[PDB]
Structure formats: structure tokens, C-alpha cells
């Protein structure tokens, strides 16, 4: 055949792959964590968005830290041979490097490690996308007017910069997930995924600002944070 290029991930396996959505809304009283109003709006938006991208979506609600780890361990031990990619969306409270189960924290690295190139062989060489709506600290943005690496082929789409709070609207859903679904809906059949996420960055950065009766939390801004260890371009569509 003619000249070939391989700059983009193969996304025409029989299945796009799993989209695991962990939606933690209600937390055990003893943790002292507030209920995350608006997160069901996020979970429903994501389910529909990834459904239309032909992901096999699994929604899970209010999982303990133990249930989160067991779920991700079990998913990582499935046969993904016929799947193009893997997507996991985490909706919860968080801190830098951490997301909360309903009863306590989970290290993000513990979750993602299950899918390392050497630990989930049927996903080796395939894009593994972790989408994280959770705080990464308490900073507020005031704004201004042979082998491959085991850590290769991961993408972490963080809702916010390192060290910063992340914003969720109780009526509309989180700024980041709102924006992400909107840009996927509009551009998944047109743009490469980094360029989609870049539009998400701009949407969140320009179109949202917090409103609070509390001066400390009022008029604040947010920028999401794309972390890519991908080795190829990612298009959700394929040719034929």
C-alpha cells in the first residue's frame, strides 16, 4: 500500500472503551465533608456526552474509598483488547494528589497505577484518560482584568491548577465539567483532544467567576490543568 503515518492513536477497535464515572455526592457524617450539590448535573452530562462518543458508560454513586480502589482494580483486570481507550471521571472532594471516597481519601496515584503499561497489558499503548473534578488545595485565583514507559499514554484532565480550589455550581454543575461536555459535544468530531481541552481551558477561564456573600470567596477565577503523557494525537472519530 501507499505511504503510511502513525501520529494518532488507533481509535477504530470494535469498542471505544469504558467510561467509568465516579460521582461522590454524599459523604459520611464523620468525615465532615459537605454534600456536593450540582454533581448529579455533572454526572448526567458526562454520561450523555460520552454515550454519544460511543463509550460504554458506567456510573457509580457514593463509593467508599475501599469501593473506589476495588472498582478500579477490577476494571483494570478486565480484558480491554477490543477497546480503543479507557476513560475514568472522578467527581468528588479532593486535595493535591487525592480524591475522596465517601469515608476518606484515596491517592490518585493508587487509582491510576492499576492501569500502568506493565500492569494492564490490554491497555498498553492505548490512551488512558483521567478526568478530575476535585479541589487540589485551597488557593483562590483572584484573576486580573523495545519497551515503553509504564507512565506513558496517560492524560490527566484536571479541573484546576495545582494547589487551587475547584468551583462547582449547585444549580449548573461544575465549571470544568460543564465546559468539558460542551466542548466535546461541539468539537469531538472535528478537533484533536488537546485542542478540545484547550478550548475548555479558555471557556472556564473567561466565562466563569464566583459570586459569594463572603469576600474571601467572591470574584474568583479558575484555570483547568491539562497534564499529558500521551505519545500520539487523540481523535474520538476515525476514518471509514
Amino acid at each position: 500500500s501507499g505511504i503510511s503515518l502513525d501520529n494518532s492513536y488507533k481509535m477504530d477497535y470494535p469498542e471505544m472503551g469504558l467510561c467509568i464515572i465516579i460521582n461522590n455526592k454524599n459523604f459520611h457524617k464523620s468525615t465532615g465533608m459537605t454534600s456536593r450539590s450540582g454533581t448529579d448535573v455533572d454526572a448526567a452530562n458526562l454520561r450523555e456526552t460520552f454515550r454519544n462518543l460511543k463509550y460504554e458508560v458506567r456510573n457509580k454513586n457514593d463509593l467508599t474509598r475501599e469501593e473506589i480502589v476495588e472498582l478500579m482494580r477490577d476494571v483494570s483486570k478486565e480484558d480491554h483488547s477490543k477497546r480503543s481507550s479507557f476513560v475514568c471521571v472522578l467527581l468528588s472532594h479532593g486535595e493535591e494528589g487525592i480524591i475522596f471516597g465517601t469515608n476518606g481519601p484515596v491517592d490518585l496515584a493508587k487509582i491510576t497505577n492499576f492501569f500502568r503499561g506493565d500492569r494492564c497489558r490490554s491497555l498498553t499503548g492505548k490512551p488512558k484518560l483521567f478526568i478530575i473534578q476535585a479541589c487540589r488545595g485551597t488557593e483562590l485565583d483572584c484573576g486580573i482584568e523495545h519497551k515503553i514507559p509504564v507512565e506513558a499514554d496517560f492524560l490527566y484532565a484536571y479541573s484546576t491548577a495545582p494547589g487551587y480550589y475547584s468551583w462547582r455550581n449547585s444549580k449548573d454543575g461544575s465549571w470544568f465539567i460543564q465546559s468539558l461536555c460542551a466542548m466535546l459535544k461541539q468539537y469531538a468530531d472535528k478537533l484533536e483532544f488537546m485542542h478540545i481541552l484547550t478550548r475548555v481551558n479558555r471557556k472556564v477561564a473567561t466565562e466563569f467567576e464566583s459570586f459569594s456573600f463572603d469576600a474571601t470567596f467572591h470574584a474568583k477565577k479558575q484555570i483547568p490543568c491539562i497534564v499529558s503523557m500521551l505519545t500520539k494525537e487523540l481523535y474520538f472519530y476515525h476514518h471509514h
Binding site: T34, Y165, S174
Partner: peptide
């Protein structure tokens, strides 16, 4: 608006 609330923080996570």
C-alpha cells in the same frame, strides 16, 4: 458557587 461552592468549592470541592
Amino acid at each position: 458557587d461552592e468549592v470541592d
